[PDB]
């Protein structure tokens, strides 16, 4: 399973199991460019989030309820949804994912 693999590699589940995790299959430039797009509030209230104009190719990785460290199972779900990230700093760049419209 892609999730078990990527998650494993990226050190996302090499010392704990992460419930959720979205991987974007678009160029980093394109993704970073989102920081100058539709400005909306994040779930945390703060209004420094920017929804993508278009839909990106993604992969929702969910931990199935039956798994426990050191064995983290992941349900892979491919999709094409708008992303919403929280940009901060200079250069303004994505530092938090937030949702997939």
């Amino acid at each position: 399973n892609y999730c078990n693999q990527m998650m494993k590699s990226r050190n996302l589940t090499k010392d704990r199991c992460k419930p959720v995790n979205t991987f974007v299959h678009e160029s980093l430039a394109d993704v970073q460019a989102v920081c100058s797009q539709k400005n909306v509030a994040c779930k945390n209230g703060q209004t420094n989030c920017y929804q993508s104009y278009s839909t990106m190719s993604i992969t929702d990785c969910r931990e199935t309820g039956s798994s426990k460290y050191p064995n983290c199972a992941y349900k892979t779900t491919q999709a094409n949804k708008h992303i919403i990230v929280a940009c901060e700093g200079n250069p303004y760049v994505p530092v938090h994912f937030d949702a997939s419209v």
């Binding site: 990527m6 990226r10 995790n21 980093l28 993704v31 530092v95 938090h96 994912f97």
Partner: peptide, 15 residues
């Protein structure tokens, strides 16, 4: 070591 914007790239980015 690993900035906030760097950690994003590693955790989510998979161009």
């Amino acid at each position: 070591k690993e900035t906030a914007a760097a950690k994003f790239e590693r955790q989510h980015m998979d161009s």
